[PDB]
Design an enzyme around this catalytic site. Structure first.
Site, PDB file in Angstrom:
ATOM      1  N   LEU A  71      43.391  32.652  64.685  1.00  0.00           N
ATOM      2  CA  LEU A  71      42.263  33.412  64.141  1.00  0.00           C
ATOM      3  C   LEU A  71      41.407  32.596  63.175  1.00  0.00           C
ATOM      4  CD1 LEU A  71      43.976  36.860  63.310  1.00  0.00           C
ATOM      5  CD2 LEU A  71      42.645  36.354  65.365  1.00  0.00           C
ATOM      6  N   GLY A  72      42.010  31.583  62.560  1.00  0.00           N
ATOM      7  CA  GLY A  72      41.320  30.741  61.587  1.00  0.00           C
ATOM      8  C   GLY A  72      42.214  30.336  60.431  1.00  0.00           C
ATOM      9  N   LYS A  73      41.681  29.495  59.547  1.00  0.00           N
ATOM     10  CA  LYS A  73      42.421  29.003  58.383  1.00  0.00           C
ATOM     11  C   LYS A  73      41.580  29.000  57.101  1.00  0.00           C
ATOM     12  CE  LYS A  73      41.758  24.225  60.045  1.00  0.00           C
ATOM     13  NZ  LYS A  73      41.667  24.554  61.498  1.00  0.00           N
ATOM     14  N   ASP A 124      36.697  37.290  42.748  1.00  0.00           N
ATOM     15  CA  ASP A 124      36.183  36.348  43.750  1.00  0.00           C
ATOM     16  C   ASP A 124      35.446  37.047  44.907  1.00  0.00           C
ATOM     17  OD1 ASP A 124      35.833  33.589  44.534  1.00  0.00           O
ATOM     18  OD2 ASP A 124      37.393  33.865  46.048  1.00  0.00           O
ATOM     19  N   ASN A 153      34.627  37.078  51.832  1.00  0.00           N
ATOM     20  CA  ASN A 153      35.760  37.963  51.538  1.00  0.00           C
ATOM     21  C   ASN A 153      35.585  39.390  52.045  1.00  0.00           C
ATOM     22  OD1 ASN A 153      36.829  36.447  48.378  1.00  0.00           O
ATOM     23  ND2 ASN A 153      37.392  36.008  50.503  1.00  0.00           N
ATOM     24  N   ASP A 156      41.461  38.693  50.311  1.00  0.00           N
ATOM     25  CA  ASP A 156      41.633  37.504  49.465  1.00  0.00           C
ATOM     26  C   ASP A 156      41.773  37.874  47.988  1.00  0.00           C
ATOM     27  OD1 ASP A 156      41.249  35.016  47.950  1.00  0.00           O
ATOM     28  OD2 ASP A 156      40.511  34.129  49.817  1.00  0.00           O
ATOM     29  N   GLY A 163      42.216  27.062  53.009  1.00  0.00           N
ATOM     30  CA  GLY A 163      43.075  26.448  51.998  1.00  0.00           C
ATOM     31  C   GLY A 163      44.405  26.017  52.586  1.00  0.00           C
TER      32      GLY A 163
HETATM   33  C1  LIG Z   1      44.177  33.424  52.737  1.00  0.00           C
HETATM   34  O1  LIG Z   1      44.146  35.936  52.844  1.00  0.00           O
HETATM   35  C2  LIG Z   1      43.435  35.727  54.010  1.00  0.00           C
HETATM   36  C3  LIG Z   1      43.048  34.421  54.620  1.00  0.00           C
HETATM   37  C4  LIG Z   1      43.457  33.278  53.918  1.00  0.00           C
HETATM   38  C5  LIG Z   1      42.982  32.065  54.632  1.00  0.00           C
HETATM   39  O2  LIG Z   1      43.715  31.110  54.802  1.00  0.00           O
HETATM   40  O3  LIG Z   1      41.607  32.048  55.141  1.00  0.00           O
HETATM   41  C6  LIG Z   1      41.110  33.321  55.610  1.00  0.00           C
HETATM   42  C7  LIG Z   1      40.123  33.904  54.595  1.00  0.00           C
HETATM   43  O4  LIG Z   1      39.044  33.001  54.365  1.00  0.00           O
HETATM   44  C8  LIG Z   1      38.397  33.266  53.121  1.00  0.00           C
HETATM   45  C9  LIG Z   1      42.271  34.285  55.919  1.00  0.00           C
HETATM   46  C10 LIG Z   1      43.202  33.660  56.958  1.00  0.00           C
HETATM   47  C11 LIG Z   1      41.853  35.607  56.556  1.00  0.00           C
HETATM   48  C12 LIG Z   1      42.273  36.923  55.950  1.00  0.00           C
HETATM   49  C13 LIG Z   1      43.048  36.990  54.674  1.00  0.00           C
HETATM   50  O5  LIG Z   1      43.382  38.075  54.148  1.00  0.00           O
HETATM   51  C14 LIG Z   1      41.835  38.143  56.681  1.00  0.00           C
HETATM   52  C15 LIG Z   1      42.397  39.517  56.304  1.00  0.00           C
HETATM   53  C16 LIG Z   1      42.138  40.377  57.544  1.00  0.00           C
HETATM   54  C17 LIG Z   1      41.921  39.357  58.639  1.00  0.00           C
HETATM   55  O6  LIG Z   1      41.631  39.660  59.787  1.00  0.00           O
HETATM   56  C18 LIG Z   1      42.108  37.943  58.162  1.00  0.00           C
HETATM   57  C19 LIG Z   1      43.546  37.530  58.476  1.00  0.00           C
HETATM   58  C20 LIG Z   1      41.103  36.916  58.673  1.00  0.00           C
HETATM   59  C21 LIG Z   1      41.090  35.593  57.869  1.00  0.00           C
HETATM   60  O7  LIG Z   1      39.734  35.146  57.721  1.00  0.00           O
HETATM   61  C22 LIG Z   1      39.256  34.352  58.854  1.00  0.00           C
HETATM   62  C23 LIG Z   1      39.168  32.858  58.737  1.00  0.00           C
HETATM   63  O8  LIG Z   1      38.925  34.931  59.879  1.00  0.00           O
END
Ligand SMILES: *c1oc2c3c1C(=O)O[C@H](COC)[C@]3(C)C1=C(C2=O)[C@@H]2CCC(=O)[C@@]2(C)C[C@H]1OC(C)=O
Length: 279
Positions: A22-24, A139, A144, A157, A26
């Site tokens: 889904l992505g990353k 933040d 976010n 976040d 940090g």
């Molecule tokens: C650290 O809490 C969350 C995330 C991180 C992180 O590593 O990057 C991204 C946020 O980018 C600012 C993460 C993976 C993401 C979430 C998160 O809570 C989201 C909460 C609901 C969701 O669908 C998540 C997991 C997506 C995700 O953001 C991205 C990159 O799509």
């Protein structure tokens, strides 16, 4: 360290199948995880223990998890449990398949006024819940404010979130209060919300520059300009939200009842087309 295909926990003893990336953010990777029994999809946040070697970094995450665990609100990313492992710490969250308001903003630039109303209202309702529960996000940004399939805003976040433990507590450990180290509480979230509303209606952040040092100076001196093209009613709200004096900023409760949220069309739903084109 290879991330396991099946993520298991000692507590619930449920099996989560690690799926689509889904992505990353940090160095913390996130995956679409499916409960191998009930078949419901969650966002599995996977963070390596090699990143949390120092007890300082172990703490943060422990506060972040603790704060998020307490939360339950249709405008806050649902926390559905966490668990440790030999090599990783796994956080199970509500899944938001439609990225954030940052991806929408980069694609759309200045959105229509009714869209700003819709997005801000849901976000403020989320922030109100946090402030009523003595939680400051600290933040708040477009990146976010996550979006699900129904285009609902979900705030996430909490890596910099804090709890106000007592009345009139000022924190010392981005709003002018934080940059000057003078002390802050709830009104830093209102400032951030003002930046967001500005960015949505204008198309660019109010203090953005190529240099990071120049950005901080403008915040300190309250140097921004709401363009003449912006509706005076919205312009008035932005200036109050981004007031130099934290005390003169509106509370989260009086945000919803502002003229801006009552003067024009406020759509109750938004189609997924708003990600790419105006409705
Ligand atoms: C650290 O809490 C969350 C995330 C991180 C992180 O590593 O990057 C991204 C946020 O980018 C600012 C993460 C993976 C993401 C979430 C998160 O809570 C989201 C909460 C609901 C969701 O669908 C998540 C997991 C997506 C995700 O953001 C991205 C990159 O799509």
């Amino acid at each position: 360290k290879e991330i396991p295909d099946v993520l298991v926990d000692p507590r619930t003893m449920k099996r989560y199948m690690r799926g689509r990336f889904l992505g990353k953010g940090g160095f913390a990777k996130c995956y679409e995880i499916t409960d191998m029994d009930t078949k419901e999809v969650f966002a599995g946040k996977v963070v390596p223990k090699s990143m949390l070697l120092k007890p300082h970094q172990k703490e943060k995450m422990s506060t972040e998890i603790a704060i998020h665990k307490s939360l339950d609100n249709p405008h806050v990313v649902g926390f559905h449990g966490f668990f440790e492992d030999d090599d990783f710490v796994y956080v199970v969250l509500e899944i938001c398949r439609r990225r954030s308001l940052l991806e929408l903003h980069k694609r759309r630039k200045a959105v229509t006024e009714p869209e700003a109303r819709y997005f801000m209202r849901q976000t403020i309702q989320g922030v109100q819940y946090l402030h009523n529960n003595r939680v400051i996000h600290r933040d708040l940004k477009l990146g976010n404010l996550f979006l699900n399939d129904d285009m609902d805003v979900k705030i996430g976040d909490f890596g910099l979130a804090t709890k106000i433990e007592f009345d009139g507590e000022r924190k010392k450990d981005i709003a002018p209060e934080v940059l000057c180290k003078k002390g802050h509480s709830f009104e830093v979230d209102i400032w951030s919300l003002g930046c967001i509303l500005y960015t949505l209606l204008v198309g660019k952040p109010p203090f953005e520059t190529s240099c990071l040092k120049e950005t901080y100076i403008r915040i300190k001196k309250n140097e921004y300009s709401v363009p003449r093209h912006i509706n005076p009613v919205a312009s008035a709200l932005i200036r109050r939200m981004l007031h130099a004096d934290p005390t003169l900023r509106p509370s989260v409760a009086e945000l919803l009842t502002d003229e801006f949220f009552t003067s024009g069309y406020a759509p109750m739903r938004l189609p997924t087309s708003c990600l790419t084109v105006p409705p």
